[PDB]
RNA sequence: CCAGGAUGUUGGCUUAGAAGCAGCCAUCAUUUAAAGAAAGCGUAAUAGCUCAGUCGAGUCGGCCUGCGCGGAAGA
């Protein structure tokens, strides 16, 4: 999966996800999957979403991952009293703001593009929209 | 699908330019016929296998209209097929006449020999003309 | 809509009586009296019957389209008449008609005696073929369906009552 | 038939018809394409 | 020239007169005899040359025998003794493999006097030169 | 080439800008040359289809405001956070 | 709706055999209004289905959006 090979810190606070997103336009490929809803993508959701599109396109073209978890999440198991120290990291998520260019693709037709991201979007928890590279 | 405007203007424009130089253009009904028969009719007229083509009454109407022609609408009723001759004597009427081998005539609605209109009762007159 | 735009013609002798929303089509064979919806507006002019919607209704034409085919078949039934031929495929499957009742032996341990509705007569040119006739297309289609339920042909041999205009596909019996 | 919230048109002979208030998928080339609850 | 009325076509070559291993009873199970495929078949086959896979219609009515009229064989059977090699392509397009030419298959597909559309000896002539290059072969025309 | 009917704005600020987006309209501004900036309110739909063409960002544009054709050029554009709409476009006198 | 829906050619290699319809490739040409070296079912290979002139004016479906639909089964 996708996760920081090294971090200055192991744990991190909650951190609210407010405001819009930055990466809204594609600057690597001709197509790509854009986000519309609000939430967070885990290493599993991102990885699984990549296999879908990457598979719907056999072994041609190229895909990019603009997003990245880089955010540890701690959780306490069952039969555990509240407190007693912060929980332990179980997985890493990535804050996705409305307009975050999730993935991108290039080297394949426009029709095959939607189909690819269509099987990948179903893997994502939040809604998404298909976008095309625009000039300026 | 359909054909774009510019793409249809040429189609009619072509069939019209060939009608201005066509020494003949007989019309008849060709329903229930097979390809083997159509080809045979084409091989008879010209060894090039090209002869007798089916066209709509419209494509022909505006084609016969785009060119100074009149009194031919009656020849355009339902299934219509044209047979013109851009070269050689337009006496190739005997070929198709013998091909249909029909004791009637109705099928061969009308025609236009050398800019001269001719009914269905004249298809035999030209088909019986001596060498 | 479009279908309603095509006025229906009524042959000679075909007496047409309109009473508000009721249509009585009496001709050469039988007499049908159907009641239109309420959004349909039939207009009896010349020797044909036009159809159109009515201000104040949504579907409008959605109803006129049906009323166009309805009365249409009504005229065809009182003129040429409808007919449905159902042949019985299989061994031991015979058929007989004693009056207004049809006896069928579809392997059942007891001969079935289907009762014919209003005006629906049928004979049997063969021990495995029935020919239904009537003036109402809806009825002649229902009766043929009833005898079609007694034994629905299986996709292996087609054994059972079927339709002369029906194509039954079969399949193998699997391997082992 | 296979009933399930999701219903689509598999083959080209598929048809999405509504009856009484329930989306159905009628087929005339493959009884397996028969669906319900859409 | 009419409609459907029996007309199969399964053969391996003109040499094998009514074979068995390749097809056998497969060339006659509806109205053709697995024996008369030498009488009416070789009625003129041995009068020319046996070595080119030549097919043929069937046409059966109900008069026991059949009136099948043999015609021109495939244009590929000329790609093993008229074009060049008989097989062995090695790699599809990763290599130009072999290569035909203009003069080649020129007067070879011309002999056809019972097929081809259009007498234009230029449009119906090159019509038998497409596949000769479609198999990775180069065009020396 | 691309004629875009415009009308000088009567009030600025995000407040007015928002009221424009709620009526199939969006804020704009034409700067450049020695002339002073001018607030402009273009139609959403209209410009929404004009920007669909790459020739809209390449070729010169002609904005008609108060009976005046000002030959400008697309400098920058701000699209909606996630919807296929426009927020504001900057034009330069050229 | 009633129609047509062809031909080179069963395209070449492979194979028991593959012919539009295992699979590698290739995908030009043709007579035309139009027909892909071929969509799905179907054959052991074929066959057989079949999709992509008349009638006479409306039809096709992606996008933005409102209101609804199914998704929705507890004592
Ligand atoms: Zn279906």
Describe the protein.
The structure is cut from a larger assembly and holds chains A (136 residues), B (131 residues), C (176 residues), D (38 residues), E (141 residues) and F (94 residues). Chain A is built from 2 helices and 7 strands. Chain A has 136 residues and is of the alpha+beta class. A 4-stranded antiparallel sheet of chain A has the order 3-6-1-7, covered by helices on one side. In chain A, helix 1 packs antiparallel against helix 2. The longest helix of chain A is centred in the middle third of the chain and has 14 residues. In chain A, 27% of the residues are buried. The longest helix of chain B has 13 residues. Chain B has one domain: Ribosomal protein L10, N-terminal RNA-binding domain (Alpha-Beta Plaits), CATH 3.30.70.1730. Chain B has a 3-stranded antiparallel sheet with strand order 1-3-2, with no helix packed on it. Chain B has a two-stranded antiparallel sheet with strand order 4-5. In chain B, a hairpin with a 2-residue loop joins strand 4 and strand 5. In chain B, helix 1 crosses helix 3. Chain D is mainly β and 38 residues long. In chain D, strands 1-4 form a two-stranded parallel ribbon. In chain D, strand 2 and strand 3 form a beta hairpin. The two termini of chain D are 13 Å apart. Chain F is built from 3 helices and 6 strands; from the N terminus they run βαββααβββ. A 6-stranded mixed sheet of chain F has the order 1-4-5-6-2-3. Chain F is globular. Chain F starts with a strand and ends with a strand. The chains are: A alpha+beta (136), B alpha+beta (131), C alpha+beta (176), D mainly beta (38), E little secondary structure (141), F alpha/beta (94). Chains in contact: A-F, B-E. The site of zinc ion has 7 residues of chain D, from loops. Chain E binds one RNA strand of 75 nucleotides through helix 1. Chain B: Keywords: Acetylation, Repressor, Ribonucleoprotein, Ribosomal protein, RNA-binding, rRNA-binding, Translation regulation. Chain B: This is Large ribosomal subunit protein uL10. Chain B: Forms part of the ribosomal stalk, playing a central role in the interaction of the ribosome with GTP-bound translation factors.
Summarize the structure.
Chain B has 131 residues and is of the alpha+beta class. Helix content of chain B is 35%, strand content 12%. Chain B has a 3-stranded antiparallel sheet with strand order 1-3-2, with no helix packed on it. A two-stranded antiparallel ribbon of chain B has the order 4-5.
Oligomer: part of a larger assembly
CATH homologous superfamily designation of the largest domain in chain C: Ribosomal protein L6
Indicate how many domains the architecture of chain C comprises: 2
Beta content of chain C = 25-35%
Keywords (chain D): Ribonucleoprotein, Ribosomal protein, RNA-binding, rRNA-binding
Subunit structure (chain D): Part of the 50S ribosomal subunit.
Protein name (chain D): Large ribosomal subunit protein bL36A
Family (chain D): Belongs to the bacterial ribosomal protein bL36 family.
